Amino acid sequence: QEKEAIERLKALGFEESLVIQAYFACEKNENLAANFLLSQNFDDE
Numbered sequence: 001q002e003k004e005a006i007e008r009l010k011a012l013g014f015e016e017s018l019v020i021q022a023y024f025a026c027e028k029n030e031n032l033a034a035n036f037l038l039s040q041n042f043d044d045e
Contacts, residue, residue: 002028009037 002023009019014037022036023029 005030005033009033012037 002020005023006016006019009023010016012034014022018037018040019033022040023033026032026036
């Protein structure tokens with residue numbers, strides 16, 4: 001499973017949904033998943 005990284009990805013200030021899709025679309029990687037969630041441009045709006 002990847003549930004281990006889920007709380008990790010979430011711990012960066014994200015959410016288990018954007019996390020899963022950022023760790024499944026990233027082919028369950030590490031530096032890739034982080035890069036996904038951190039590269040997901042999203043401000044006030």
